[PDB]
């Protein structure tokens, strides 16, 4: 009917509400996905040496710890 | 040589679709942020709708940051925040742009009633919209698979359809789809297919739509427009000062609605950009895209979707389409219509002292009006050191300034204007005369042309600044230069009420009066007798007079005699110039004769003598009327002595018919009608009773017993002279007044038996109220109704101007007296006067040429035609004129405020329409709408039917709802048979031969028929005789020329039949068409020429088609005109009136007609 | 006291398209006059004040006109500090300043003064 | 004053060209290029030009004749100047 | 401007930091002042006349 | 009321009364026809250009009225100049052609 409120309201109404169990399913899939790329990044040599070149610049007072890492586990 | 690159005097204008690269050309920056102003320092936030960087400095020649504040640094872009320091004017000019995230549809080309994207793609609108909102997928460049190019699919259908064929099939949705469709479209190819399809199938339904589409397409192709551009990539932003944020008092701010709108479009757009880098789900980016689509629509044209409302304010915010648009068409030139400097206005008073060429101008108005003139003259003569000191002198009203003002005034006309400007005489130039007091004084003689009373009407003054305007004001619009109405050549300067009562009292005679019988040497000692108290003003007297007749060849003859006349007439003869005979003043001199006096004076001695004469008549009229002591007392209105008896006798009749209705001898209706008539007869009886008693009753004695003359009673003199009052109105004062009418339209069968000299009682008065109340409304609505008519009229003519000199067509219309049923409802001399003969006219015998071929017919020639018995003269009209794009003066006629034949370039269209419109206030099927019905071509409800073709006719087939009529021509093929509903009573004789155009039934006939069957000259005559009936029944004089020029525009268009250049059925200009088949008849093709058929368009329909699109955007619906031209890329060449005014140049008529001509030839010329 | 200041910027701007009066196409925006323009009865007196000072400047010595046109921005980019003028003219500092005085002095005692005095009201 | 221009319209037919020509002429007097051809009654350049038309000593031809002449009168002054622009070569 | 600035040097006038907003009698209307009222914001010190 | 040169409106530069010295008189469509019916072209141009809508011509004119040269160098009324930006702010490319 145009009036975009309606063609929105009607477009989302198709998507089914998640079951309380379905919520955890999707979140688990997310973890795997990111974790695939996290491990995939760890396997790149340039990814390490680059991290090295960034911290060697931090200790020389050419940068700050806040512009490189957000902290580790801990 | 080199043509140019920088600024010249531009000609024409072009309108077209805008490329993204083209929009970017205008843009001085991308407005990237909804921010307006800083909120503390009220400075513009940078990269926002108001940005000094993008648009321009807030203040003159000053950088925003303030680093370069000096008027010296100018083209410098500040290194800190880029602002080139320049006048703030550039904030009114520089545009901007916005690069849109998703493509967007242009509401104008999507939603204008003939959807441009829709018929350019031959795709339904609802489908295109379903694609824009993501409600279905549409195919593009479908290839060979399963699917049509424009076919539409659903989610599941697209998926199933996608699984089968991965490639060689393509489908999209949203704006990108429509844009892909338009870009992919090959226009050339569609025409070929469309041309073939046109030829194969013959059906009106089919090829009607076909021709519409093909016209747009080949138009769009030749246009230069690329279809893709109807979908917006880049969105221009309007310069800030055209939607300013300016502050107000008390510190509140106020700004244009575009800002609330523009901001939204920016925001949604910006969020959408963001939602892509956040990779939002489909359901969202679609919704943001839909939302962006809505905002662009509200910005551009609001009201075509949801009608967005302004922030915190209920009223829907006004959009860009609404800024151009309005009621009606454009706000700029439309009534009304721009305020103008060097003007004023005030209440007006009399000023009988004025000569006919001048006016009383308040001292103070003139000081403020001519202020720059006064300043420069003050320091031109050195009375003021500098312009500032000059300001202080006149601001002080120093005594010396008044004399300088008389200098700047002396030869310097001013324009006077009244409120409902109807004909061109609504503005007239006068020479100003300095007057103490706050009132404008207006020459009485002009008060008539303006329709200006002294009951407080106010008038406006305008100063003609430029030299060309002073000589225009003096030589065109000047009072003395227009003394004659352009509607009919009769003088509009006619003496008015008081003045004509004076001359009536002056030339008049009673039976016995002082000096009766004596004789005097000349008018001089007649006045010496009167002023000295010896002789009465009116007494029968012989006096020696010397009259003149110019009957030589341009030479004044003299003849002197003893004329038997009165004292008053002898004195008045003193005013009459030269070659007029004494005969003109020897009559009783009423208002009618007193106008024909002026008329003849104009047609014999010319302009100058008529002017100085006209003045004189006024002065003398007022003066002698003042001596006369005419008044109106209550004993001046005389009721007949037999009145009580007439009412009583007529009242018996009513009680008789009543006895017949109670006894059933007569029906209720038959009774009612009877009573209404007997009462009616009584009104006539009483009225023609008081009129006889009132009229002649001065009954006096000379040396003998008795004699009786026309009464000298005051109120009678008023009505006989023509000053004021009329037999109808006098009748209401003394005799009974009328039978009023109840609101529903019935007429009360109990008239008002009393009058105003007597009392009207509660009932009589209460009943009179309805007539008064309806009276006022009718004039007030019919005043407005008339104006609408003149509007439609000047629109259909306007650009019509005398262009050629003599077109040289022998063609013309036959002029006969109107001769309706009685004797001669209008003579021949008036119909033929001032026209030009189509061919030489004979005496009753021949090899005798009275009038030779085309000769202007003036008064001597018309008397020469009247001398001979000549009853019919063929005359050239503007309706038959062969000149294309105008009227040749020779075909027009002479008429003007001047007697000469119309000059080259005068705009007749305006003066035709205005002349038809101005009297329309005075009108009353029939009435003023009947006139509108005529000019609108409207076909009556139950029209008659005319024989389609000559030959013997008969009836065929049977009663289906139509009983067929079969015509059988002698030589030719029979096949014409028309289906006529048989429940309408016929006329055409079943056994008789009927000529084409005969009456096959009765009832009115559509002028469409008359043009088609009977021909052009015939139909033009029908209109003129019909509209002229309405006006003439009311006493309105309008020369047929004006009705004819309007008519010419009515038939301006025609519909082609044959072919060989342009399309079959196209409706088009006989100007264009006639130029194309006349060019082909020679040169070109040996003869390939196409035949047309002339069409009759109502005035309002014909004005719709206008070559100039700027003209159409004024009075038509602005949105539609602009789209339809921008698609076709129409190039407006100016050349018309309306458009040149819009753009602000010399009208291509009148003084300007010389200019445009001089340029037009430079154009399309080496 | 910030209530007033704060309360003011807090108000929403008024639609300039607000119809006012007569129901006529008169809208709020039609009445907001241009204050940034310069009225012609003024611009003319400016074009006049130029001709005035140019007249009174041909009345001075050729060096006084150059030094005074220099010391003010008259018909030149910017204007020059009295030292800057000293470098172009070669006799510097106090020398130039005196000339300035007499120039203003010659335009001061009315013959010169009668025309230019009328610009200040 | 000039009450009616009727006399002027006779000399030049058009009656619009009267406004144009009398204007062009009226400027020859107002911007000081010329002086009147007939006694000035204090009539402003508007009316003086019209009196000049009435007397038949001014119309589009005469003006065009005078101007084409002044071109050579000025072309007579500048002769030795512009030829001196032989540095062209 | 330059020429206005020279003007001030000759006639030695100090051009104020204030613009003239005074209410002055409408042009041409002339009468007698029969009253004056002074309303002041609550919190601003009332002036002499007020 | 009478006005020589008054104040002017911001949105469109047109005569407007701000001092209660009233803005000039309103010249209408019908009043325009009246000038077109007479042959007066220059009176009409000066009415709808220099006397009103032309931000330049008014001042260029005023200096000439005192200078003693009655002329007008009309230029283009600001009304149409605005219509141009407004059409062009839409998707419509409107240009002034030729020479
Ligand atoms: Mg009245
Ligand atoms: Zn800066
Ligand atoms: Zn013709």
From Swiss-Prot, chain A:
| Superkingdom of source | Bacteria
**Cystine connections:** none
Query: Where found?
Result: Cytoplasm
Protein family membership? Belongs to the sigma-70 factor family. RpoD/SigA subfamily.
- What job does this protein perform? Sigma factors are initiation factors that promote the attachment of RNA polymerase to specific initiation sites and are then released. This sigma factor is the primary sigma factor during exponential growth. Preferentially transcribes genes associated with fast growth, such as ribosomal operons, other protein-synthesis related genes, rRNA- and tRNA-encoding genes and prfB.
The text the record gives for the protein's domains is:
Contains 4 domains, connected by flexible linkers. In the active conformation, the domains are in an extended conformation, each making extensive interactions with the RNA polymerase catalytic core. In the autoinhibited state, sigma-70 factor domain-1 packs closely together with sigma-70 factor domains-2 and -4, contrary to the extended conformation that is seen when the protein is part of the RNA polymerase holoenzyme.
Q: Quote the protein name from its UniProt record.
A: RNA polymerase sigma factor RpoD
From what organism does this protein derive? Escherichia coli (strain K12)
Name of the gene encoding the protein in the UniProt record? rpoD
From Swiss-Prot, chain B:
Q: Which Gene3D superfamilies match?
A: 1.10.132.30, 1.10.150.390, 1.10.1790.20, 1.10.40.90, 2.40.40.20, 2.40.50.100, RNA polymerase II, clamp domain, RNA polymerase Rpb1, domain 3
Residues given in the record as Mg(2+) binding sites? 453, 455, 457
Cite the effect that the entry attributes to residue 683 to D. Resistant to antibiotics salinamide A and B
Q: What is the effect of changing residue 731 to C/H/P/S?
A: Resistant to antibiotics salinamide A and B
Q: Which cofactor does it need?
A: Mg(2+); Zn(2+)
Q: How is it used?
A: Co-administration of salinamide and rifampicin or salinamide and myxopyronin suppresses the emergence of resistance to both antibiotics.
Enzyme Commission number(s) from the entry? 2.7.7.6
Tell me the CDD domains matching this sequence.
Answer: RNAP_beta'_C (cd02655), RNAP_beta'_N (cd01609)
Mind naming one GO cellular-component term on file for this protein?
Answer: membrane
State the reactions this protein catalyses: RNA(n) + a ribonucleoside 5'-triphosphate = RNA(n+1) + diphosphate
Substituting residue 776 to R results in: Resistant to antibiotics salinamide A and B
Sequence positions that bind Zn(2+) 2: 807, 881, 888, 891
Documented effect of changing residue 775 to A/C: Resistant to antibiotics salinamide A and B
Q: Cite the entry's keywords alphabetically.
A: Acetylation, Antibiotic resistance, DNA-directed RNA polymerase, Magnesium, Metal-binding, Nucleotidyltransferase, Transcription, Transferase, Zinc
PTM summary: Acetylated on several lysine residues in the presence of glucose.
| InterPro entries per the UniProt record, alphabetical | DNA-dir_RpoC_beta_prime (IPR045867), DNA-dir_RpoC_beta_prime_bact (IPR012754), RNA_pol_asu (IPR000722), RNA_pol_N (IPR006592), RNA_pol_Rpb1_1 (IPR007080), RNA_pol_Rpb1_3 (IPR007066), RNA_pol_Rpb1_3_sf (IPR042102), RNA_pol_Rpb1_4 (IPR007083)
Top-level taxon: Bacteria
Q: Does the keyword Hydrolase apply?
A: no
Sites binding Zn(2+) 1 sit at 63, 65, 78, 81
GO MF entry, a single one: DNA-directed RNA polymerase activity
A GO BP term, please? cellular response to cell envelope stress
Family affiliation: Belongs to the RNA polymerase beta' chain family.
Task: Tell me the HAMAP family matching this sequence.
Answer: RNApol_bact_RpoC
Gene from which this protein is expressed: rpoC
Curated annotation (Swiss-Prot), chain D:
InterPro entries under this entry? DNA-dir_RNA_pol_omega, Pol_omega/Rpo6/RPB6, RPB6/omega-like_sf
Superkingdom of the organism of origin:
Bacteria
Q: Which GO terms describe its cellular component?
A: cytosol; cytosolic DNA-directed RNA polymerase complex; RNA polymerase complex; transcription elongation factor complex
Give the enzyme's EC designation.
2.7.7.6
Q: Which GO terms describe its biological process?
A: bacterial-type flagellum assembly; bacterial-type flagellum-dependent cell motility; cell motility; cellular response to cell envelope stress; DNA-templated transcription initiation; intracellular iron ion homeostasis; nitrate assimilation; protein-containing complex assembly
Q: Name one Pfam family in it.
A: RNA_pol_Rpb6
Q: Which UniProt keywords apply?
A: DNA-directed RNA polymerase, Nucleotidyltransferase, Transcription, Transferase
Gene Ontology MF term list: bacterial-type RNA polymerase core enzyme binding; DNA binding; DNA-directed RNA polymerase activity
Tell whether Repressor is among the UniProt keywords. no
Catalytic activity annotation: RNA(n) + a ribonucleoside 5'-triphosphate = RNA(n+1) + diphosphate
What is the stated purpose of this protein? Promotes RNA polymerase (RNAP) assembly. Latches the N- and C-terminal regions of the beta' subunit thereby facilitating its interaction with the beta and alpha subunits. Part of the processive rRNA transcription and antitermination complex (rrnTAC). The complex forms an RNA-chaperone ring around the RNA exit tunnel of RNAP. It supports rapid transcription and antitermination of rRNA operons, cotranscriptional rRNA folding, and annealing of distal rRNA regions to allow correct ribosome biogenesis.
What NCBIfam families does the record tag this protein with?
Answer: rpoZ
Swiss-Prot record, chain F:
Q: What does the record say about its biotechnological applications?
A: Co-administration of salinamide and rifampicin or salinamide and myxopyronin suppresses the emergence of resistance to both antibiotics.
Taxonomic superkingdom: Bacteria
Q: Could you state what the record's PTM comment says about this protein?
A: Acetylated on several lysine residues in the presence of glucose.
Q: What does this protein do?
A: DNA-dependent RNA polymerase (RNAP) catalyzes the transcription of DNA into RNA using the four ribonucleoside triphosphates as substrates.
Q: How does it assemble?
A: The RNAP catalytic core consists of 2 alpha, 1 beta, 1 beta' and 1 omega subunit. When a sigma factor is associated with the core the holoenzyme is formed, which can initiate transcription. The rRNA transcription and antitermination complex (rrnTAC) consists of RNAP, NusA, NusB, NusE (rpsJ), NusG, SubB, ribosomal protein S4, DNA and precursor rRNA; S4 is more flexible than other subunits. In pull-down experiments interacts with CedA. (Microbial infection) Interacts (via flap domain) with Escherichia phage lambda antitermination protein Q; this interaction renders bacterial RNAP resistant to transcription pausing and allows it to read through termination signals.
- Family statement drawn from the similarity comment of this UniProt entry: Belongs to the RNA polymerase beta chain family.
Name under which the protein is recorded: DNA-directed RNA polymerase subunit beta
Query: Which start and end residues of the full protein are shown?
Result: 1244 to 1342 of 1342
């Amino acid at each position: 009917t145009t009036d975009p409120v309606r063609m929105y309201m009607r477009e989302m109404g198709t998507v089914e509400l998640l079951t309380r169990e379905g919520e955890i399913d999707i979140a688990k899939r997310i973890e795997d996905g990111i974790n695939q790329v996290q491990c995939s990044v760890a396997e790149y040599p340039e990814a390490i040496t680059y991290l090295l070149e960034q911290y060697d610049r931090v200790e020389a007072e050419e940068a700050r710890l806040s512009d490189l890492i957000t902290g580790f586990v801990d | 040589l080199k043509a140019q690159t920088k600024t010249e005097e531009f000609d024409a204008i072009k309108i077209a679709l805008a490329s993204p690269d083209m929009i970017r050309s205008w843009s001085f920056g991308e407005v990237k942020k909804p921010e307006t102003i800083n909120y503390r320092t009220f400075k513009p936030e940078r990269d926002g709708l108001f940005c000094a960087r993008i648009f321009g400095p807030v203040k003159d020649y000053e950088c925003l940051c303030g680093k370069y504040k000096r008027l010296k640094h100018r083209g410098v872009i500040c290194e800190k925040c880029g602002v080139e320091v320049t006048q703030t004017k550039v904030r009114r000019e520089r545009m901007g742009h916005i690069e849109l995230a998703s493509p967007t549809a242009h509401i104008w080309f999507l939603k204008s009633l003939p959807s441009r994207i829709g018929l350019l793609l031959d795709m339904p609108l609802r489908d295109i919209e379903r694609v824009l909102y993501f409600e279905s997928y549409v195919v593009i460049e479908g290839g060979m698979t399963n699917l049509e190019r424009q076919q539409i699919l659903t989610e599941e259908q697209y998926l199933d359809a996608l699984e089968e064929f991965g490639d060689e099939f393509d489908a999209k949705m949203g704006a990108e789809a429509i844009q892909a469709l338009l870009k992919s479209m090959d226009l050339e190819q569609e025409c070929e297919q469309l041309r073939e399809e046109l030829n194969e199938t013959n059906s009106e339904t089919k090829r009607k739509k076909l021709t519409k589409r093909i016209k747009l397409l080949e138009a769009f192709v030749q246009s230069g427009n690329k279809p893709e551009w109807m979908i917006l990539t880049v969105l221009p932003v309007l310069p800030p000062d055209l939607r300013p944020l300016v502050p107000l008092d008390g510190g509140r701010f106020a700004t244009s609605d575009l800002n609330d709108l523009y901001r939204r479009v920016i925001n949604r757009n910006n969020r959408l950009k963001r939602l892509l880098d956040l990779a939002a789900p489909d359901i969202i980016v679609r919704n943001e895209k839909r939302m962006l689509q809505e905002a662009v629509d509200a910005l551009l044209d609001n009201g075509r979707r949801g009608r967005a409302i302004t922030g915190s304010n209920k009223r829907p915010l006004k959009s860009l389409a609404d800024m151009i648009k309005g009621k009606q068409g454009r706000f700029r030139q439309n009534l009304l219509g721009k305020r103008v400097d060097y003007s004023g206005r005030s209440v007006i008073t009399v000023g009988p002292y004025l000569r006919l060429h001048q006016c009383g101008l308040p001292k103070k108005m003139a000081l403020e009006l001519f202020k720059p003139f006064i300043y420069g003259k003050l320091e031109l003569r050195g009375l003021a050191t500098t312009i500032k000191a000059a300001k202080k002198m006149v601001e002080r009203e120093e005594a010396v300034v008044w004399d300088i003002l008389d200098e700047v005034i002396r030869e310097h006309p001013v324009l006077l204007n009244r409120a409902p400007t109807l004909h061109r005489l609504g503005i007239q130039a006068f020479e100003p005369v300095l007057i103490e007091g706050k009132a404008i004084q207006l020459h009485p003689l002009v008060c008539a042309a303006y329709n200006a009373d002294f009951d407080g009407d106010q008038m406006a003054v305008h100063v003609p600044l430029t030299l060309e305007a002073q000589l225009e004001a003096r030589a065109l619009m000047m009072s003395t230069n227009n003394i004659l109405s352009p509607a009919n050549g009769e003088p509009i300067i006619v003496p008015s009420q008081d003045v004509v009562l004076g001359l009536y009292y002056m030339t008049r005679d009673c039976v016995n009066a002082k000096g009766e019988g004596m004789v005097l040497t000349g008018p001089k000692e007649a006045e010496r007798l009167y002023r000295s108290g010896l002789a009465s003003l009116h007494a029968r007297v012989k006096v020696r007079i010397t009259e003149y007749e110019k009957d030589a060849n341009g030479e004044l003859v003299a003849k002197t005699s003893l004329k038997d006349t009165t004292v008053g007439r002898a004195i008045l003869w003193m005013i009459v110039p030269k070659g007029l005979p004494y005969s003109i003043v020897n009559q009783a001199l009423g208002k009618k004769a007193i106008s024909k006096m002026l008329n003849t004076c104009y047609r014999i001695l010319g302009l100058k003598p008529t002017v100085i004469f006209a003045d004189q008549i006024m002065y003398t009229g007022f003066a002698y009327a003042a001596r006369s002591g005419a008044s109106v007392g209550i004993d001046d209105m005389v009721i007949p002595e037999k009145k009580h008896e007439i009412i009583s006798e007529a009242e018996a009749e009513v009680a008789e018919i009543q006895e017949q209705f109670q006894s059933g001898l007569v029906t209720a209706g038959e009774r009612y009608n009877k009573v209404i008539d007997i009462w009616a007869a009584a009104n006539d009886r009483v009225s023609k009773a008081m009129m006889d008693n009132l009229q002649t009753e001065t009954v006096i004695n000379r040396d003998g017993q008795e004699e009786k003359q026309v009464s000298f009673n005051s109120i009678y003199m008023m009505a006989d002279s023509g000053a004021r009052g009329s037999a109808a109105q006098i009748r209401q004062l003394a005799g009974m007044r009328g039978l009023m009418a109840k609101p529903d339209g019935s007429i009360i069968e109990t008239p008002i038996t009393a009058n105003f000299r007597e009392g009207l009682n509660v009932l009589q008065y209460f009943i009179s109220t309805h007539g008064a109340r309806k009276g006022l409304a009718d004039t007030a609505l019919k005043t407005a109704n008339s104006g609408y008519l003149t509007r439609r009229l000047v629109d259909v003519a306007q650009d019509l101007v005398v262009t050629e000199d003599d077109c040289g067509t022998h063609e013309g219309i036959m002029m006969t007296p109107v001769i309706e049923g009685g004797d001669v409802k209008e003579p021949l001399r008036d119909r033929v006067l001032g026209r030009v003969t189509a061919e030489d006219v004979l005496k009753p015998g021949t090899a005798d040429i009275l009038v030779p071929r085309n000769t202007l017919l003036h008064e001597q020639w018309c008397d020469l035609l009247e001398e001979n018995s000549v009853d019919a003269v063929k005359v050239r009209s503007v309706v038959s004129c062969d000149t294309d794009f105008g009227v040749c003066a020779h075909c027009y006629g002479r008429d003007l405020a001047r007697g000469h034949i119309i000059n080259k370039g005068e705009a007749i269209g305006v003066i035709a329409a205005q002349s038809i419109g101005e009297p329309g206030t005075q009108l009353t099927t029939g009435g003023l709408p009947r006139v509108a019905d005529l000019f609108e071509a409207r076909r009556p409800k139950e029209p008659a039917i005319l024989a389609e073709i000559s030959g013997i006719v008969s009836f065929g087939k049977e009663t289906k709802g139509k009983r067929r009529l079969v015509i059988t021509p002698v030589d030719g093929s029979d096949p014409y048979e028309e289906m006529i509903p048989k429940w309408r009573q016929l006329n055409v004789f079943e056994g008789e031969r009927v000529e084409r155009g005969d009456v096959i039934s009765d009832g009115p006939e559509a002028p469409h028929d008359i043009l088609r069957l009977r021909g052009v000259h015939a139909v033009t005559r029908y209109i003129v005789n019909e509209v002229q009936d309405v006006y003439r029944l009311q006493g309105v004089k309008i020369n047929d020329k004006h009705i004819e020029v309007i008519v010419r525009q009515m038939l301006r268009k025609a519909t082609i039949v044959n072919a060989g250049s342009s399309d079959f059925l196209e409706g088009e200009q006989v100007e264009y068409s006639r130029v194309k088949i006349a060019n082909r008849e020679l040169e070109a093709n040996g003869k390939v020429g196409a035949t047309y058929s002339r069409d009759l368009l109502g005035i309002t329909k014909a004005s719709l088609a206008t070559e100039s699109f700027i003209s159409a955007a004024s009075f038509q619906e602005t949105t539609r005109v602009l789209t339809e031209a921008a698609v076709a890329g129409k190039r407006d060449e100016l050349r018309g009136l309306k458009e040149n005014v819009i753009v602000g140049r010399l009208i291509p008529a009148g003084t300007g007609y010389a200019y445009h001509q001089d340029r037009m030839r430079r154009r399309a010329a080496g | 006291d910030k209530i007033r200041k704060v309360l003011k910027i807090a108000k929403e701007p008024i639609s300039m398209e607000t119809p006012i009066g007569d129901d006529e196409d008169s809208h709020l925006g039609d009445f907001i006059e241009d204050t940034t323009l310069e009225l012609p009865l003024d611009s003319a007196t400016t074009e006049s004040l130029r001709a005035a000072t140019h007249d009174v400047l041909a009345g001075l010595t050729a060096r006084e006109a150059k030094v005074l046109r220099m010391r003010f921005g008259i018909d030149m980019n910017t204007d020059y500090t009295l030292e800057e003028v000293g470098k172009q003219f070669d006799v510097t500092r106090e020398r130039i300043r005196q000339i300035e005085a007499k120039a203003l002095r010659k335009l001061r005692h009315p013959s010169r003064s009668e025309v230019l005095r009328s610009f200040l009201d | 004053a000039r009450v009616t221009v009727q006399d002027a319209v006779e000399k030049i037919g058009n009656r619009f060209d009267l406004v144009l020509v009398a204007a062009r002429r009226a400027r020859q007097m107002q911007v000081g290029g010329k002086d009147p051809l007939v006694p000035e009654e204090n009539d402003k350049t508007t009316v003086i030009a019209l009196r000049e038309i009435e007397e038949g000593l001014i119309n589009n031809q005469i003006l065009d004749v005078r101007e084409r002449q002044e071109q050579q009168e000025q072309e007579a002054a500048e002769l030795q100047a512009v030829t001196a622009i032989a540095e062209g070569r | 401007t330059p020429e206005e600035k020279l003007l001030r040097a000759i006639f030695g006038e100090k051009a104020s930091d204030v613009k003239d907003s005074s209410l002055r009698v409408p042009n041409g209307v002339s009468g007698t002042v029969i009253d004056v009222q002074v309303f002041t914001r609550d919190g601003v010190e009332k002036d002499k006349r007020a | 009321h009478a006005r020589s040169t008054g104040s002017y409106s911001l949105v469109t530069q047109q005569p407007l009364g701000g001092k209660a010295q009233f803005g000039g008189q309103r010249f209408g469509e019908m009043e325009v026809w009246a000038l077109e019916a007479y042959g007066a072209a220059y009176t009409l141009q000066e009415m709808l250009t220099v006397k009103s809508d032309d931000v330049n011509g008014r001042t260029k004119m005023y200096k000439n009225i005192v200078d003693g040269n009655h002329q007008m160098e009309p230029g283009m009324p600001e009304s149409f100049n605005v219509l141009l930006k407004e059409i062009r702010s839409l998707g419509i490319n409107i240009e002034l052609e030729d020479e």
